[PDB]
Design a protein around this ligand. Sequence first.
Ligand SMILES: O=c1ccn([C@@H]2O[C@H](COP(=O)(O)OP(=O)(O)O)[C@@H](O)[C@H]2O)c(=O)[nH]1
Ligand SMILES: O=c1c(O)c(-c2cc(O)c(O)c(O)c2)oc2cc(O)cc(O)c12
Length: 443
Amino acid sequence: NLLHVAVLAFPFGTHAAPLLSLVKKIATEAPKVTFSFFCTTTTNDTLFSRSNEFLPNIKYYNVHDGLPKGYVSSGNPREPIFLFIKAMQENFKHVIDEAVAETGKNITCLVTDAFFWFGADLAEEMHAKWVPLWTAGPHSLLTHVYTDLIREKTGSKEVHDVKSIDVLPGFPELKASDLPEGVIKDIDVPFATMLHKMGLELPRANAVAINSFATIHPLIENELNSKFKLLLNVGPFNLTTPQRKVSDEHGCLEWLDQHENSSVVYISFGSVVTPPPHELTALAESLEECGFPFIWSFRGDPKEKLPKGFLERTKTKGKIVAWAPQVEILKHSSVGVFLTHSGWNSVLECIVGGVPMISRPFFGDQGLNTILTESVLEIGVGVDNGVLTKESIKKALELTMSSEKGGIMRQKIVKLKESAFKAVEQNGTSAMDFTTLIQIVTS
Ligand SMILES: O=c1ccn([C@@H]2O[C@H](COP(=O)(O)OP(=O)(O)O)[C@@H](O)[C@H]2O)c(=O)[nH]1
Ligand SMILES: O=c1c(O)c(-c2cc(O)c(O)c(O)c2)oc2cc(O)cc(O)c12
């Protein structure tokens, strides 16, 4: 047993955990194969002693983060990401040498985040297979694959939201501002250059894995499939690679048990985003005004970012936590709506939970995920003008909580949820792609 799987993870956002969970699923199934997980010290330290406390064939290694000694944030929170992207290809090669040296075995398969375009070349010089994992939706991926074409049929009118573009099958016409950032807008930051190159290199992979399921959207999925040697839909991860990890220090679930069905508003804008002060106060004031019970996963100091007295004034109406057991929250019968930024993992967890969504996208692929949930799947609505105001908020809440539209939305998300469960059954489409994925990775 000499196989050695090198796993390259993106240290930012919700990328390393899902990749690790996919890897663990594969690892337990192949106890004789060696797995090496590469990420930054910080991210790896965070990834530890979870549900699967440890797997004997998984070893973690720290890739250099590209930060200068005595580094402090000043420009933007994207600064450290850019610094990481700068020397990531050479730094991953460096740290890879440590794992080969330690295990005494050469890399046979390179599993990477799809963001790592260099995987094809790296896999080639190592005489190894390349299996990239796109952690977001099939629709955003297709958009990245079509970056060059989209740029072609795009002049000034297109860039200035004048004319729209028929970029995706079964999708509304898109406005430049709707495209995942980096495709048409700011094609200059390192992030954009990384995705652009990703789009061009993926066809070289042995197979492209994705956190999705085929029936979520047949047209997009089939279109995506024809761009790669193989497209393996191994999601939704919240079903195919779940974690026993269920932390609820603040008693969110017991708190939800004391509430009636479809009555509570769950709020979370993702792992990092912090809405602007004027939006926070508008949501705060809207919450303690419409009287909906709520659980708000807040990033930062609430006594500092929220109106004075908000906490004490709503101490019985809702809970404000620094972090919450979202997957379980969304599956709880007391939740009637999910105010989200529409990150992909949150969209999939909500689909399994069967809860209508209110979306207020901030960056990346969020805008496209909102169009997907609002105009295509119709399992959620966006807020007027894409911003949170007392007016846009109250409008979205009534539509999802007290209107017939709320029911149609729940009806559709429920059909979708069932399609997901079917894809993950013993012989479902995802279970099968997952078996294929495992074979490719461990052969
Ligand atoms: O209070 C929270 C807030 C977020 N999450 C998890 O954080 C992840 C967010 O990923 P997503 O792709 O939705 O957005 P991102 O964090 O990448 O912006 C999801 O798995 C959520 O379940 C959670 O467990 N508890
Ligand atoms: O964190 C970031 C991020 O996730 C994305 C992103 C863009 C896309 O187009 C996608 O399809 C996607 O899934 C993610 O862009 C970024 C662009 C930046 O300048 C800075 C960032 O920090 C991000």
